[PDB]
Amino acid sequence: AGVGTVPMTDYGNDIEYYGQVTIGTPGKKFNLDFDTGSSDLWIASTLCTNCGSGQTKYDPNQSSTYQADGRTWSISYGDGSSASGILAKDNVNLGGLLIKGQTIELAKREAASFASGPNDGLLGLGFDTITTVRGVKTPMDNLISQGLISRPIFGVYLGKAKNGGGGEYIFGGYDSTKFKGSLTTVPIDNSRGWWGITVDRATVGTSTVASSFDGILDTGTTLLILPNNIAASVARAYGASDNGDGTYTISCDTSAFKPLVFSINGASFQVSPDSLVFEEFQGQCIAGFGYGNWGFAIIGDTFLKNNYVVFNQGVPEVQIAPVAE
């Protein structure tokens, strides 16, 4: 793969996307979930006492570039999953870019959901204002300051399991074979440490289901999570029924549905009919959109697997275009 190019693996039905990262000297390969909603790089380690037997664990003793650190860390994600441990320093190779002396977080403890998932840890791609430990420079910060990328951007392509899966992240560039037409520039609000954008409106056919709302681009979230009123409005347009747990039951037959269209900075971006269904279990389908009690939307994989995004940390801003498919 080209310089800074990281091929991704699509886990299950577009649940998450992970890539291989080499840490240490000589180094081990780790499968990390690439998360634009967080800013900590943590990995399962041999200091962990409740980690999965299937996870690959970082072993300080086997890295000649390991450097001890006296600080501890703890994190808790949006769904309550958590992990904790100690800080360390080592080299990280991201698509051939060798970041020297990156602060890495070794887990001593992790939630059962991490122990049973496909990840060895997470790579945070949010802004450095939300690292859990103050003074920690994120991998993007280090790629820029070490001169490993000449433009402070990363291009993101998330594939659809229905089309073969895959995905690809490119640090320092983007790939126009993955999208169609012209990219639309959208300003980013990073005041809360996330990639925040404003959606002008949302329509289903001729119906305006929502007026302008703010949301965050989160590759680490599976669904499109909307504020309660907006979610209900969307659900009514598709005849979806509320499961009372933040999810909806929708018809498995999407052949009759119109796309969920977002108007962003004057252009149209959509959630295609097929993406309206997340998963099918014993003939019942769970929708690709859900609800949460926040005033902003979490624009997750349901949306990102339909739209290519170029993330620019420098401005900050994003460039979006419909996926080529």
Binding site: G37, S39, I75, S76, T219, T221, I298, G300
Partner: peptide, 5 residues
């Protein structure tokens, strides 16, 4: 589903 902070 997952909900990454």
């Amino acid at each position: 589903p997952f909900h990454x902070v």
